[PDB]
Amino acid sequence: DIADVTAVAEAILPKGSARVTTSVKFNAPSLLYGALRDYQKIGLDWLAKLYRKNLNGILADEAGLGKTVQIIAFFAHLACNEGNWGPHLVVVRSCNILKWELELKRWCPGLK
């Protein structure tokens, strides 16, 4: 039943008024070039937990919070910690394709 999946998703939701006080000492993946902000690490951990539970999610962070960087970090985590080097598909606006490519090369140049 959908209620069970919703309960699991609610159990995966980061706790806290701002969802920024997470005890999970999530270390940035070694393949990611650069330093992630604390909220970006929290988003990355949430994405990793969603992947481990085979669940989907919606990232509704306000514009400019680095959602693309969060996705790049998620790919780096999948490659380093989950062994998921497989073909990933990203669908973006044509005006953002070059931006996404440049961000991927800047943050994780090791990915084809």
Binding site for another protein (CB under 8 A): 2-3, 5-6, 9-10, 12-14, 18-20, 31, 37-39, 43, 46, 55-62, 64-65, 79, 83, 85, 102, 105-106, 109-112
Query: Least distance to another protein from the beta carbon of 70, Å?
Result: 10
Query: Least distance to another protein from the beta carbon of 12, Å?
Result: 8
Report DSSP letters for 44-57, one per residue. Answer: HHHHHHHHHTT---
| CA-to-CA dists, residue 6 to 10, 44, 62, 89, angstroms | 6, 20, 24, 26
| 67 is an annotated ligand-binding site residue | yes
Nearer to another protein, 39 or 100 (CB): 39
| CA-to-CA dists, residue 64 to 1, 18, 79, angstroms | 36, 17, 25
Nearer to another protein, 92 or 102 (CB): 102
**Do 27 and 36 touch, CB atoms closer than 8 A?**
no
| 82 is an annotated ligand-binding site residue | no
Nearer to another protein, 10 or 23 (CB): 10
Q: Which residue has the tokens 């989950």?
A: 82
